[PDB]
Write a protein that binds this ligand. Sequence first.
Ligand SMILES: *[C@@H]1O[C@H](CO)[C@@H](O[C@@H]2O[C@H](CO)[C@@H](O[C@@H]3O[C@H](CO[C@H]4O[C@H](CO)[C@@H](O)[C@H](O)[C@@H]4O)[C@@H](O)[C@H](O[C@H]4O[C@H](CO)[C@@H](O)[C@H](O)[C@@H]4O)[C@@H]3O)[C@H](O)[C@H]2NC(C)=O)[C@H](O)[C@H]1NC(C)=O
Ligand SMILES: *[C@@H]1O[C@H](CO)[C@@H](O[C@@H]2O[C@H](CO)[C@@H](O)[C@H](O)[C@H]2NC(C)=O)[C@H](O)[C@H]1NC(C)=O
Length: 815
Amino acid sequence: SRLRQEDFPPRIVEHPSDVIVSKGEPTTLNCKAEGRPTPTIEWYKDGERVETDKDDPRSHRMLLPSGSLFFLRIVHGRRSKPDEGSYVCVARNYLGEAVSRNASLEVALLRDDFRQNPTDVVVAAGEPAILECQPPRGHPEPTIYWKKDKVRIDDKEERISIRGGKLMISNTRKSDAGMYTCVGTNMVGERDSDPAELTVFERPTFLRRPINQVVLEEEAVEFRCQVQGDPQPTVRWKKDDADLPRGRYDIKDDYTLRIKKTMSTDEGTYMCIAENRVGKMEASATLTVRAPPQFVVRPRDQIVAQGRTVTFPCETKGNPQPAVFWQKEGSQNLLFPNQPQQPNSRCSVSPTGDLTITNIQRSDAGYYICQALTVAGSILAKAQLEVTDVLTDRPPPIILQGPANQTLAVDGTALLKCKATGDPLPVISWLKEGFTFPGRDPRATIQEQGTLQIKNLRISDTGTYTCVATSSSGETSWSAVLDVTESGATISKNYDLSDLPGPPSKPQVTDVTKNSVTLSWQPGTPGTLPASAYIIEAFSQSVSNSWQTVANHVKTTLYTVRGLRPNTIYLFMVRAINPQGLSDPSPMSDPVRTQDISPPAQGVDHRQVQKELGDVLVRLHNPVVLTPTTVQVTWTVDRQPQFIQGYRVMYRQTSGLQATSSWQNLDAKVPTERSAVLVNLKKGVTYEIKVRPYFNEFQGMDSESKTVRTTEEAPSAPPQSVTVLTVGTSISVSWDPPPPDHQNGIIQEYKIWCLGNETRFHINKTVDAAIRSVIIGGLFPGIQYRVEVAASTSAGVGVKSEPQPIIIGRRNEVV
Ligand SMILES: *[C@@H]1O[C@H](CO)[C@@H](O[C@@H]2O[C@H](CO)[C@@H](O[C@@H]3O[C@H](CO[C@H]4O[C@H](CO)[C@@H](O)[C@H](O)[C@@H]4O)[C@@H](O)[C@H](O[C@H]4O[C@H](CO)[C@@H](O)[C@H](O)[C@@H]4O)[C@@H]3O)[C@H](O)[C@H]2NC(C)=O)[C@H](O)[C@H]1NC(C)=O
Ligand SMILES: *[C@@H]1O[C@H](CO)[C@@H](O[C@@H]2O[C@H](CO)[C@@H](O)[C@H](O)[C@H]2NC(C)=O)[C@H](O)[C@H]1NC(C)=O
C-alpha cells in the first residue's frame, strides 16, 4: 500500500500453453508476468493451489526465477494423478491480480491392440501388393512405419511408397517375400503389429524344353519337358492343339512323353503345357515320321494282243506319300499322272499310279518301269509288255472228246467218236496200234465228224485206236482201247451223249517264275456224276508242236505246275476227272512267259536329283506383252536333265493396290515347254517374273527376275457427282474418288470442259491427279455453261461423266 504513479497491476506476457507429456519425464509450464512491485506468481490446477518446493522441500515441482512451473519428473498413477489437470499461473501485487489462460497437462498414452492389423497378402511377381495398417489409439496420435523381417524399410523408392496406413511395393520379386510388421510410435514408445506375410508366386518357367525329333516308323520316341514355378505347375500334353489319341503315348512321372510304336499318323506338333495359379505357358516341338517308299501293288508282265488296252498297276505307300512316275527302258522321257498330253498319244497315268496304253501297237512292246521317289528313299519295278499280231502263232488243234474204251461183241458194227476244233480247221486221221488206218481193210472207214466206223466186227480188230487231228498249226492225238470178244458186250455203261461234266473256268494265272506257273479255275458241273480231280494240258510254240499233260490227278483248284522251260510262253487247259470218263477242255489260258519277276529295286537317290535340278540354269529372255491382260513369257534351259517334271513360273504385282505381296503361281506341266501366256492380269501394272524348274514335291533354283509392265489403257468409268458452290459468279467442280478397276491405270490428270451456252467459247483447264476440287477462272458473265469432268491416264483421252447445266448469275453474286 505504497502509492506511486509508477506502480502498475500485473500483466502476464507469456501465457502457458497446453502440453501433452510423458510420465517420469521433465516439463516446464511457461509463465512470465510484469508488475510494479514485481508480482508473486502461484499456480492453480482445476481449483486448488499448486504446492511448489517452497511450500515443502520434499515436493517435485519447482517455481523458476522466471515464474515457469518446472516439474522434474511428471508423476502419474491409476488412482492418484497429481500432475494431470488444468493449470493457470496467477501473478499478484497490492494493486491487483492477473489469472492466465487455461493450460492442461495430459499424460502420454499408447495402447497395445492395433486399430487394424496388417493382413496376409498373396501376389504374382511383377504385380503390385498393398499392405495396410492402423496403429492403436494414442495421445498424441501415433504414426506408423514398416519392418521386413525385423528390419526397417525405407520409402526411398518409386516402387515402395508409404502413404497413410498403406504400404505398397510394385514389380514384386521373391526378395520381397517374408514377415511384415507395422510399428506404431509415439513419444510413449512403439508397439509392433501382428506379422503379415507376403508370398510372391511366379508363373511357370521351362527348365528343359522339348526338342524337335525326326524318326522312322514303328520306332519309339520321347519328348522331355521339365518345368519350374510357384506353386509347382502341372504339366499336360497336346498334339496339334488336340488331346493325344489314346494308344501308344505314355506319360512318365518325370513328365517325359513316350510314343512306343511310331506311325505315319503320329506325326505332328506336340506341345507341353505348364499351369499353376498364376496362369499357363506352352512350348512345342515337332515329330516327323520317315516311311521309305514301298509298293502296295507293283506291275507284272503282260502278253497282250494288238489293238486292245493294257493296264499296269503301280500303287505306292510311304511318308511322304510317294509320287509315281513311269519310264520305258531305253527312253529318256518320263510320264506323270495328272499331266495331260495331246489326244494323239495312248500312254496315260492314273492319279493312283496305274499306266494305261490303249490300242496297242507292235511299237509299244518292251519293258516299262514305275518309280517312286521321296526324301525317305526311292524304289522302282519293271515289267515287260509283249504285243502279238493277227496270228504271230496260232494254238495247235484241240480234241474236245476222243473215242472211249468201247467193248463190243463179234460180228457187230463198231463206231468210235472224236470231236475236234481249231484254226485252221483240222484233218482227222487214224492209227491202229501205231500204223496207218484203215490201211488195207475195206470193212473199216474214217468218218468226217470224227467218228471211225467198222462194219462186221472180228477178234482181229481188237486193239488201241488213235484219233489224230492235224492242221498247219500243229497236231494232237487221242487214243482208246477197243475189245472184241464173242459174248462180251456186257451192259456196264452204254454209250454216253452229253452226260459228261461240262468244261471248267478258263484258267487264271497267279504267280509265275522261271520253272513254275500257278493256275486258278472254278468247276463247271453241267453234267452227271461228281468230279474227283483235274488234269492240266499245256502248250508251247518252242518246246512242242502239240498239247501235253503237265499235271494229272490234282485235288485242288489252285495248283502250281512245276518244272517248265524258262523264257518260254505257255498256254493251258483244264479238265475234270470223274468215273464216267473225262470232261471237255476249259478255254485256253492267257499267254504267259516263264521269267522270274524283277524284284523291287532302289531308284536314283533324292539327293542326286536335287543336285541335278539345282544345277539347271533357266535363262529368261524378257516378258512380251500381248494385250493389257496378257503377257507371253519365254525362257531357255542350259541343259535339261532326266529328272524334271516341268517349269513353275511365278509372278507378283509391284504396282498400286497390294504391291510386293504374294506370288501368283501357275506352272507348265510339260518339261519340253519353253513358253507360257499369263491370264486375267491388270493393265498398266508392273509385274516381276521368275521361272523355276520343278520335279515333284521337289523344286529347283529360280531364274534371273524380269520386271515388265502392261501397256496402258484409258479408264472405262470416270468420277461422278458434280457439286457447285455459290460465290459470295464462277462455277465450281467437285467429285468423289472413281472406281479402282475402272481406273484402267495410274491416274494422270483431270480435264474440265465448258462447252455451254457459248458454242464458240470452250474453257479448258488441265490439272493433275492429286487434285480433288478446283474453281474455274475466266467465265463469261450470265451465260449458262456445262461441266464434264474426265478421268485420264497415260493413254490420253479419258471418259466424260455426269453433265451439269447449272444456272449462273451476274457479277459478284448469283441472281
Ligand atoms: C480207257 O482205258 C485206260 C487204259 O487203262 C484207262 O486209263 C487209266 O486210268 C487210270 C486212272 O486211275 C490210270 O492208272 C492209275 O492212276 C493212279 C492214280 O490214282 C488217282 O486216281 C484216282 C481216280 O481219279 C483218284 O480218285 C485217286 O485219289 C488217285 O489220286 C495211280 O495210283 C496208278 O498208276 C500206277 O502206274 C504204274 C503201274 O502201271 C506204277 O508205276 C505207278 O507207281 C502207279 O501205281 C493207277 O494204276 C492209268 O494210268 C490209265 N491207263 C493208262 C496207262 O493209260 C481209262 O479206263 C480209260 N481212259 C482214260 C484216259 O482214263
Ligand atoms: C478455462 O477453463 C474453462 C474450463 O474449466 C473454460 O471453459 C469455460 O467454462 C466457463 C465456466 O467455468 C464458461 O463461463 C465459459 O463459457 C467457458 N469458456 C469458453 C468461452 O469456451 C474456459 O476456457 C476458461 N475459463 C475461464 C477462466 O473463464
